[PDB]
């Protein structure tokens, strides 16, 4: 599954639901600290809508269980991650993923 | 992968302009240690963007200015074809003229 | 080093006799003078009538009453007798030995700072 | 297995594409095989700088130290800009150690961005994490959030028991640091990045503790030294801003814990000549006279009943007439004075036996006496005044008296405070004599001056009787890209401080260790004494004065060097203006300057002719072009960083040789160390620190776990190595084991007690400590343990080591006997095999890659290819690296502008900085360290390897391989690319 650790307080009331569009500024490193993703350098929030399973299930669950204005950390196991069928060019297939999200602009 | 085309275009235009000014000034510290290292990557990027088509009409007008202000003028700065340049820069600017 | 203690000075009514002994165990050198200090609860610690070896007694403004003092150099003990008890006499009494003799030191800050205090004992007047 | 080379990268590039045809299968195979690992290949990313500021309050207890030991301070966080410039703002508060905590711009542990709590010499508290040894441990708190605006941080430190505790907004922090090293002094420190606003609170007139201090703790404002004043300052620096511009600063002098304890000399135990009963009696009489005069001036009178209020002298006699409790006191006073005088190495006695007759006293009018009457005439002593030697004698007497008083106070429990609190048994004068202000020194010295004047007036016979070098020497040089080979050049150096500056021209091969002028590489001038230094200091010109400027001059057309001072040419002894003649060009020359401890100075190049002073006088009209005049960018400079780092052993070391024989039968491959010059002239012996070039890493998850059994060989996780210590090498003061990548200690007398180790104990909601993890920089066997295991044995000492990557327990063994030295580590940690040796023989040590029964040799964990090969191997990559004390580092072009002021008595000192500053950091995977990308200018091999790596990236991404392009987007970022294009240096 996915492990939940808050980093900053948020609203805590209006949780996102299915059919809503959410933008996030996330940063993802390996289990050993090898960074692979950073939405900060892309200069563009990452957009996703819950229900289309376009993103991995661990990220979807973690985004759903948080509220807006709250920065948090996610630890995703290989089961909820890509698993043994990941990209052969960025990360090893079997590696727990640590993400630092801050969900904002709930829609 | 997608990178902001207009932002990259403006960045390239500004850095090309500053590189042209630096080259026009007789400085004993070329960017990267050589005139080739100072201009050839710049010219390659400019040609790539130009064939990509991102450059607008005004931007191409400015490019013509920094190539040659007196020849490319519409009814001071030193033309890019004027100062002595190495063979790689020569090839790149020949590609631009092509 | 020089560990000192007051013994006595319990609670009694007005005019009660109180024997406070004061003894300092330590190096016998620089043991020529000493005194007693009085600190009312929440007030400054002033000076009780001091005594120095040779039975040299020196009084102050806080001696209005019976403030008897007697020293013995052989056993190095000094006894303060508190027989006159007044409402303003309730205080913690400390006992302090010092090299400075007769309250004077032709040396300055070092010897002056060369003093030894004690734990002391609380005396209350009823 | 064969290190980093570019030929194999060229081979891979050839494999990728050929004849304008891209082999997608080969490209994808190469991608899968190397990209996901993110190891054995250089990595780059953009980071932010970190700056740390301390409160200039140093506290630390020792044997007899005057420090109170219990301290408490508070920090206000008012403005935070989270995720500024696409990066989270760094902000930490904690304590740091005076020695071992040397933060520098960039070059942090692991990747860049170091701060408090990233090194074992410092401890910091994050918003919800505790930082120590670059380890992040989240902390449970009633409110778990990062440092936010309007936040209160309380930090308390106890030295009696080694405790550091924290509290957030009145809620205590459930994690503390214990069992830390008490060597040195501790000071508050805050580390921060751009976009912060903090305020210090130390109590007293300064600031205000919004929360009451814990019982038994004292505010930090009272720990300021009497001559010191409260003022914020950075931890350490090598440059500063000033009216002329960049002013380089040298090493900074710092105090030690041993300084805080008084160290007097016993004097009463010393016997004295029989002059005490004759002349010391007269001196005591003089003391009586002067004291009586002091009372007379003060208005004290002669009343036989001693009363201070009524101003009555108990004796009430002109002669002191004091009894034994009084007379003896003054006599023993004078006797102790003479004992101290003799203990200072001076004589005690009489040398004229007639000068006392010449003394005639000073008669005074009758107004001096009153009441019963005491007018002791001051015995005139103008016949012999105090020589400077006598003044030094008085100073040392006062120092000794203050030290004996202070040792008595510390024995009876006196702790220094800025304020005076007798009920709390705290005085401002409890600091040592040399730490006292001039007023207390005068009060402890005046009477002793009078006594010494009495001695003189009578005319007595009294007569008067490596790593530190690296830390106290700093050197600055250029980028080496401007190595002039011909022409005439001029550059100026203003010596703001009179101290020892060494300025001159040096060859590009200047070793950081070698001092300027000690070798033929550098022709320098040292005007502290005013001589030119080259293979020795030879007189040349005159020494300068604070504020002077030196016009260094070189002409390679004439092969000479000229030094001018304030427009005046320094002129040699023989009559030649040139400092040196016939200076061959060789490999060119560069400006060089070296600063001493506690020194500042401005180094002006020829960039600004207008600011170049005296150039028209000397430099101009002689053809000497100002150096780097046409440069538009500032001349990048390199500073001699004094930081121990492990580097490979040079093959040309005159004293140490590495043999590396391997492939023997019944003996595993090994690496031998020999002393080339042992038992010969100039055979220097000193402590040596060695390690292997590659580490081994533990498993990410610590989930337990004759002829050797193959199944046990496959199943086993342990790895083994051995060390052969030859006869003649000291079995003590030697260590074998495993060190962290960031471990570095250049101690000349290193000990296993000298390693850095702190136990972070994690309290729960009930206050019970859990997760008591001991962060230690090293783990190896003690030399006393080695010698106990065991003249030196002729049989070579065998030192085996067993590492268990699955569970994390660490085992050691000596001569086939398992030594009691054992350890436990954390998952996802890598260690280097290290040997520390004190050479005492021609043949000292020999590292050995060996296996044992059902034990897998190190090479399997060391290299992935041989992970399942039982045969022990020693690939050429595995080499021995020695601890290098000093290495060269490049100064950043720009520095953060931090403004610190004192807002008021309520807000305290406010620190604010809001200018962003970013740089590209290049990280080494195996060494777990990073360096600036611009530093690769002088590192051609790494630059070439990185360039070939970029070429390999282009090859694998060539011909529209979009999947490979997306894969490479992770390794190389758009922001990194844009910063590279906008980079100028």
């Amino acid at each position: 599954g996915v492990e939940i650790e808050t980093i900053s307080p948020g609203d805590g009331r209006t949780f996102p639901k299915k059919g809503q569009t959410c933008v996030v500024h996330y940063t993802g490193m390996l289990q050993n600290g090898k960074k692979f993703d950073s939405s900060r350098d892309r200069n563009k929030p990452f957009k996703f809508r819950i229900g289309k399973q376009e993103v991995i299930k661990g990220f979807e669950e973690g985004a759903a269980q948080m509220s807006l204005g709250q920065r948090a950390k996610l630890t995703c196991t290989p089961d909820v991650a890509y698993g043994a069928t990941g990209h052969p060019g960025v990360i090893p297939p079997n590696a727990t993923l640590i993400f630092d999200v801050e969900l904002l602009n709930l829609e | 992968p997608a990178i902001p085309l207009e932002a990259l275009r403006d960045k390239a235009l500004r850095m090309l302009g500053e590189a042209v000014r630096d080259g026009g000034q007789h400085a004993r510290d070329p960017v990267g240690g050589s005139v080739e290292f100072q201009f050839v990557p710049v010219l390659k990027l400019v040609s790539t963007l130009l064939v990509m088509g991102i450059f607008g009409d005004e931007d191409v007008k400015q490019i013509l200015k920094m190539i040659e202000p007196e020849v490319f003028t519409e009814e001071l700065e030193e033309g890019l074809l004027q100062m002595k340049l190495p063979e790689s820069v020569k090839l790149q600017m020949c590609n631009l003229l092509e | 080093q020089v560990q000192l203690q007051e013994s006595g000075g319990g609670l009694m009514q007005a005019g009660g006799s109180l024997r406070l002994s004061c003894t300092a165990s330590g190096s016998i050198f620089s043991i020529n003078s000493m005194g007693w200090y009085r600190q009312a609860p929440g007030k400054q610690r002033e000076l009780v009538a001091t005594i120095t070896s040779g039975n040299s007694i020196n009084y102050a403004d806080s001696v209005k009453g019976r403030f008897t003092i007697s020293r013995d150099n052989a056993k190095n003990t000094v006894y303060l007798q508190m027989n006159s008890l007044k409402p303003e006499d309730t205080a913690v009494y400390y006992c302090n030995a010092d090299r400075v003799p007769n309250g004077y030191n032709p040396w300055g800050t070092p010897n002056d700072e060369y003093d030894y205090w004690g734990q002391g004992t609380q005396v209350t007047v009823s | 297995k064969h290190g980093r080379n570019h030929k194999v990268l060229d081979v891979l590039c050839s494999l990728c594409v050929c004849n304008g045809v891209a082999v997608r299968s080969n490209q994808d195979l190469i991608t899968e095989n190397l990209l996901p690992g993110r190891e054995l290949l250089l990595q780059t990313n953009l980071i932010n700088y970190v700056t740390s500021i301390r409160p200039n309050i140093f506290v630390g207890r020792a044997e007899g130290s005057t420090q109170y030991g219990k301290w408490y301070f508070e920090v206000m966080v008012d403005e935070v800009v989270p995720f500024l410039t696409a990066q989270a703002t760094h902000l930490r508060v904690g304590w740091a150690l005076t020695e071992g905590y040397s933060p520098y711009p960039g070059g942090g542990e692991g990747w860049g961005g170091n701060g408090v709590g990233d090194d074992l010499y410092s401890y910091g508290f994050d918003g919800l994490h505790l930082w120590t040894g670059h380890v992040a441990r989240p902390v449970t708190s009633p409110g778990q959030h990062l440092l936010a605006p309007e936040d209160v941080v309380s930090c308390c430190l106890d030295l009696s028991v080694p405790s550091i505790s924290f509290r957030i907004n009145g809620c205590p922090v459930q994690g503390v640091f214990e069992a830390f090293n008490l060597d040195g002094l501790f000071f508050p420190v805050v580390s921060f990045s751009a976009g912060v606003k903090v305020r210090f609170l130390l109590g007293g007139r300064h600031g205000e503790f919004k929360f009451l201090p814990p019982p038994g703790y004292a505010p930090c404002h009272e720990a300021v030294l009497p001559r010191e004043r409260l003022r914020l300052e950075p931890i350490k620096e090598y440059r500063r801003e000033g009216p002329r511009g960049p002013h380089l600063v040298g090493p900074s002098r710092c105090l030690s814990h041993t300084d805080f304890v008084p160290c007097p000399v016993d004097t009463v135990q010393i016997v004295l000549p029989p002059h005490l009963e004759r002349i010391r009696e007269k001196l005591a009489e003089n003391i009586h006279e002067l004291w009586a005069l002091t009372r007379i001036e003060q208005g004290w009178t002669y009343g036989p009943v001693r009363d201070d209020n009524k101003r009555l002298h108990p004796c009430l006699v002109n002669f002191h007439s004091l009894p034994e409790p009084e007379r003896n006191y003054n006599l023993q006073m004078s006797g102790e004075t003479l004992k101290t005088l003799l203990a200072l190495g001076c004589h005690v006695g009489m040398a004229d036996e007639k000068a006392e007759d010449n003394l005639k006293k000073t008669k005074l009018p009758k107004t001096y006496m009153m009441s019963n009457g005491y007018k002791p005439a001051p015995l005139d002593l103008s016949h012999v005044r105090l020589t400077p030697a006598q003044t030094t004698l008085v100073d040392r007497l006062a120092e000794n008296g203050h030290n004996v008083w202070a040792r008595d106070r510390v024995a009876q429990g006196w702790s220094y405070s800025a304020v005076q609190d007798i009920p709390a048994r705290r005085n401002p004068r409890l600091v040592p004599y040399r730490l006292l202000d001039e007023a207390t020194k005068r009060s402890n010295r005046d009477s002793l001056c009078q006594a010494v004047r009495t001695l003189l007036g009578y005319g007595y016979n009294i007569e008067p009787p490596n790593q530190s070098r690296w830390d106290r020497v700093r050197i600055f040089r250029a980028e080496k890209s401007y190595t002039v080979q011909s022409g005439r050049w001029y550059f100026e150096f203003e010596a703001v401080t009179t101290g020892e500056m060494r300025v001159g021209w040096a060859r590009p091969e200047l070793r950081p260790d070698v001092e300027l002028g000690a070798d033929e590489l550098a022709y320098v001038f040292n005007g502290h004494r005013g001589q030119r230094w080259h293979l020795g200091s030879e007189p040349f010109g005159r020494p300068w004065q604070s504020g002077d400027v030196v016009g260094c001059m070189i002409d390679l057309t004439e092969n000479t060097i000229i030094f001018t001072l304030n427009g005046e040419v320094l002129m040699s002894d023989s009559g030649s203006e040139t400092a040196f003649r016939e200076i061959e060009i060789g490999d060119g020359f560069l400006p060089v300057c070296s600063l001493g401890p506690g020194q500042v100075g401005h180094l002006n190049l020829g960039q600004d002719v207008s600011s170049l002073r005296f150039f028209a006088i000397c430099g101009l009209q002689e053809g000497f072009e100002p150096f780097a005049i046409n440069m538009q960018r500032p001349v990048t400079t390199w500073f001699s960083k004094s930081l121990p780092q492990f580097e490979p052993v040079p093959p040309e070391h005159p004293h140490y040789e590495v043999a590396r024989m391997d492939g023997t039968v019944d003996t595993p491959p090994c690496l031998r160390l020999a002393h080339r010059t042992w038992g010969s002239q100039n055979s220097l012996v000193e402590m040596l620190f060695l390690r292997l070039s590659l580490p081994v890493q533990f498993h990410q998850h610590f989930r337990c776990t004759n002829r050797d059994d193959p199944e046990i060989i496959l199943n086993t996780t342990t790895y083994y190595y051995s060390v052969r210590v030859f006869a003649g090498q000291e079995p003590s003061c030697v260590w074998v084991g495993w060190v962290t990548p960031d471990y570095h200690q250049h101690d000349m007398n290193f000990d296993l007690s000298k390693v850095r180790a702190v136990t972070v104990t994690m309290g729960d909601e009930q206050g019970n400590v859990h997760s008591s993890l001991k962060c230690s920089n090293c783990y190896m066997v003690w030399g006393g343990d080695f010698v106990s295991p065991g003249r030196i044995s002729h049989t070579d000492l065998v030192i085996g080591c067993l590492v268990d990557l699955a569970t994390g327990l660490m085992t050691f063994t000596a001569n086939g006997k398992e030594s009691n030295t054992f350890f436990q580590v954390e998952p996802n940690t890598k260690l280097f095999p290290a040997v520390f040796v004190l050479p005492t023989h021609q043949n000292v040590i020999q590292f050995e890659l060996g296996k044992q029964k059902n034990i897998m040799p190190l090479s399997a964990a060391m290299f992935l290819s041989e992970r399942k090969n039982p045969a022990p191997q020693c690939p050429p990559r595995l080499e021995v690296q020695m601890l290098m004390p000093v290495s060269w580092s490049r100064m950043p072009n720009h520095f953060l502008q931090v403004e610190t002021r004192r807002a008021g008595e309520r807000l305290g000192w406010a620190v604010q900085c809001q200018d962003p500053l970013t740089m590209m950091a290049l990280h080494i995977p195996e060494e777990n360290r990073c360096m600036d990308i611009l530093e690769l200018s002088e590192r051609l091999d790494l630059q070439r390897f990185h360039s070939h790596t970029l070429r390999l990236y282009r090859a694998v991404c060539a011909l529209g391989n979009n999947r490979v392009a997306h894969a490479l987007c992770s390794h190389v970022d758009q922001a990194q690319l844009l910063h590279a294009l906008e980079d100028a240096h």
Side-chain angles (χ1 to χ4, degrees), chain A:
Chain A
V2 63
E3 294 82 66
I4 297 89
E5 285 89 3
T6 181
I7 310 179
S8 66
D11 163 68
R13 164 51 210 81
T14 187
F15 293 99
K17 215 43 171 173
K18 63 92 176 179
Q20 301 179 342
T21 301
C22 307
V23 308
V24 297
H25 295 105
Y26 72 99
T27 303
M29 302 66 68
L30 259 68
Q31 188 175 337
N32 300 356
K34 293 311 222 213
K35 43 204 169 273
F36 50 72
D37 278 32
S38 180
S39 179
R40 313 287 176 174
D41 76 5
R42 309 189 181 102
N43 309 354
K44 175 190 59 180
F46 168 67
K47 295 182 184 292
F48 164 72
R49 188 269 298 164
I50 313 186
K52 185 174 73 175
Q53 62 265 8
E54 183 289 338
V55 68
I56 52 180
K57 83 192 71 53
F59 209 82
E60 183 178 1
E61 294 192 357
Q65 61 85 29
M66 279 321 179
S67 71
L68 61 83
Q70 172 189 358
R71 168 187 173 182
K73 194 195 69 41
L74 302 84
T75 310
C76 311
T77 58
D79 291 331
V80 297
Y82 303 99
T85 63
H87 306 167
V90 287
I91 70 182
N94 187 7
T96 77
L97 306 186
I98 295 90
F99 287 96
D100 177 18
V101 296
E102 167 195 20
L103 171 153
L104 73 164
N105 297 115
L106 184 49
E107 203 74 20

Side-chain angles (χ1 to χ4, degrees), chain D residues 610-627:
Chain D
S610 59
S611 176
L612 200 50
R613 285 182 293 185
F614 299 88
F615 168 58
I617 320 298
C618 66
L620 194 52
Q621 285 85 26
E622 294 178 353
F624 291 91
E625 313 173 6
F627 178 89

Side-chain angles (χ1 to χ4, degrees), chain D residues 49-53 84 105 192-198 234 237 239-242 246 892-901 910-918:
Chain D
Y49 293 97
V50 182
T51 310
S52 55
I53 305 297
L84 176 60
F192 59 89
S193 290
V196 298
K197 180 67 173 66
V198 294
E237 68 171 8
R239 194 204 57 83
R240 188 179 303 177
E241 60 182 3
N893 298 335
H894 305 271
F895 300 90
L896 305 85
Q897 302 172 358
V898 183
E899 42 172 2
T900 67
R901 292 183 291 113
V911 178
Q912 45 180 359
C913 177
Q914 60 184 359
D915 291 331
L917 211 59
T918 59

Side-chain angles (χ1 to χ4, degrees), chain D residues 848-864 866-890:
Chain D
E848 304 161 308
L849 279 298
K851 72 177 304 300
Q852 280 179 327
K853 184 82 170 197
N854 298 359
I855 303 179
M856 182 36 48
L858 292 192
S859 58
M862 282 215 88
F863 306 93
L864 174 57
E866 323 299 326
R867 195 148 309 274
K868 289 307 181 178
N869 290 318
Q873 321 156 11
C874 284
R877 198 180 183 180
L878 188 56
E879 302 174 2
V880 180
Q881 298 176 2
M882 61 79 71
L883 189 58
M884 187 66 204
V886 190
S887 59
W888 279 105
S889 174
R890 177 187 174 272

Side-chain angles (χ1 to χ4, degrees), chain D residues 29-48:
Chain D
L29 284 174
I30 299 179
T31 293
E32 156 63 4
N33 288 351
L34 69 94
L35 276 71
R38 303 188 179 273
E39 188 186 359
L40 305 183
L41 189 55
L42 298 176
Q43 320 294 352
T44 60
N45 185 14
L46 293 173
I47 68 173
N48 292 13

Side-chain angles (χ1 to χ4, degrees), chain D residues 196-296 299-300 303-306 309-314 317-320 322-323 325-353 355-365 367-383 386-485 487-491:
Chain D
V196 298
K197 180 67 173 66
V198 294
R199 286 188 293 91
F200 279 85
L201 301 170
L202 315 169
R205 180 195 67 97
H206 181 74
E208 184 273 350
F209 291 165
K210 288 180 51 39
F211 296 77
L212 276 297
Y217 282 58
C220 297
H221 77 283
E222 77 164 8
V224 55
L225 294 185
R227 45 168 43 94
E228 278 183 357
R229 299 188 65 263
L230 197 46
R231 161 223 56 179
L232 296 174
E233 65 183 1
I235 310 302
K236 294 171 180 54
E237 68 171 8
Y238 44 80
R239 194 204 57 83
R240 188 179 303 177
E241 60 182 3
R244 189 173 184 182
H247 293 83
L248 295 171
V249 297
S252 62
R253 178 71 274 172
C254 65
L255 281 70
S256 64
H257 57 278
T258 61
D259 191 359
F260 273 86
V261 64
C263 183
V265 179
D266 302 357
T267 69
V268 289
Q269 310 171 0
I270 307 181
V271 70
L272 294 171
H275 296 84
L276 276 294
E277 64 199 352
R278 304 183 293 267
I279 61 171
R280 187 267 299 164
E281 302 290 357
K282 311 168 188 178
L283 319 178
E285 275 292 78
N286 300 354
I287 301 304
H288 296 296
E289 302 160 353
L290 275 296
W291 176 63
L293 303 169
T294 64
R295 278 95 51 77
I296 287 175
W300 188 278
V305 178
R306 173 45 182 260
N309 305 357
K310 196 176 175 182
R311 297 285 221 170
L312 299 193
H313 180 72
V317 178
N318 185 329
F319 175 70
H320 68 96
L322 300 170
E326 303 297 329
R327 183 173 306 186
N328 306 1
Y329 174 89
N330 298 16
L331 294 182
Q332 75 195 4
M333 171 206 269
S334 302
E336 295 153 356
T337 306
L338 298 192
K339 302 163 189 177
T340 51
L341 188 62
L342 188 153
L344 301 177
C346 183
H347 311 82
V348 168
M350 187 66 204
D352 291 331
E353 290 83 4
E356 74 295 334
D357 187 14
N358 186 14
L359 307 172
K360 298 174 177 58
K361 288 199 173 185
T362 304
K363 311 309 172 178
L364 315 188
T367 67
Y368 284 76
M369 61 79 71
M370 293 297 102
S371 287
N372 194 359
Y374 62 101
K375 187 175 59 178
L379 188 151
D380 182 14
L381 299 153
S382 63
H383 308 68
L386 288 79
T387 75
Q390 300 298 325
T391 65
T392 62
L393 293 174
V394 192
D395 301 351
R396 278 190 302 296
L397 300 165
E399 189 275 332
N400 196 352
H402 176 92
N403 289 11
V404 298
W405 164 65
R407 72 170 308 271
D408 292 331
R409 306 292 86 179
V410 298
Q412 296 175 359
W414 282 78
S415 298
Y416 160 77
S417 177
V419 301
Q420 188 169 359
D421 192 349
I422 297 90
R425 187 175 64 246
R426 306 180 60 85
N427 287 351
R429 302 158 308 277
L430 294 174
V431 297
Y433 200 83
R434 73 279 191 189
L435 276 75
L436 295 170
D437 61 333
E438 71 294 334
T440 302
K441 290 178 173 176
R442 194 171 306 96
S443 175
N444 307 356
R445 186 185 300 96
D446 45 5
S447 302
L448 289 65
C449 297
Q450 324 302 337
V452 170
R453 188 48 174 269
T454 70
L455 320 175
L456 306 172
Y458 289 70
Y460 291 168
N461 63 6
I462 62 174
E463 307 169 2
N466 189 3
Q467 190 174 22
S468 298
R469 149 189 53 180
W470 312 134
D471 306 352
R472 289 133 181 88
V473 179
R474 192 163 298 177
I475 312 173
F476 306 92
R477 69 165 171 84
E479 187 83 6
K480 303 184 56 179
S481 56
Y482 324 109
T483 47
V484 289
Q485 307 278 340
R488 290 172 287 183
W489 310 109
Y490 166 71
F491 84 97

Side-chain angles (χ1 to χ4, degrees), chain D residues 601-654:
Chain D
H602 187 98
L603 183 52
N604 189 359
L605 278 297
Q607 311 188 219
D608 43 6
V609 289
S610 59
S611 176
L612 200 50
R613 285 182 293 185
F614 299 88
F615 168 58
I617 320 298
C618 66
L620 194 52
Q621 285 85 26
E622 294 178 353
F624 291 91
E625 313 173 6
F627 178 89
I629 177 181
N630 196 16
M631 301 315 78
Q632 296 73 14
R633 281 82 65 193
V635 169
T636 63
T637 58
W638 292 67
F639 64 100
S640 187
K641 181 199 62 179
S642 298
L643 167 59
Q645 290 177 337
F646 272 85
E647 300 178 7
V649 179
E652 62 184 0
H653 193 298

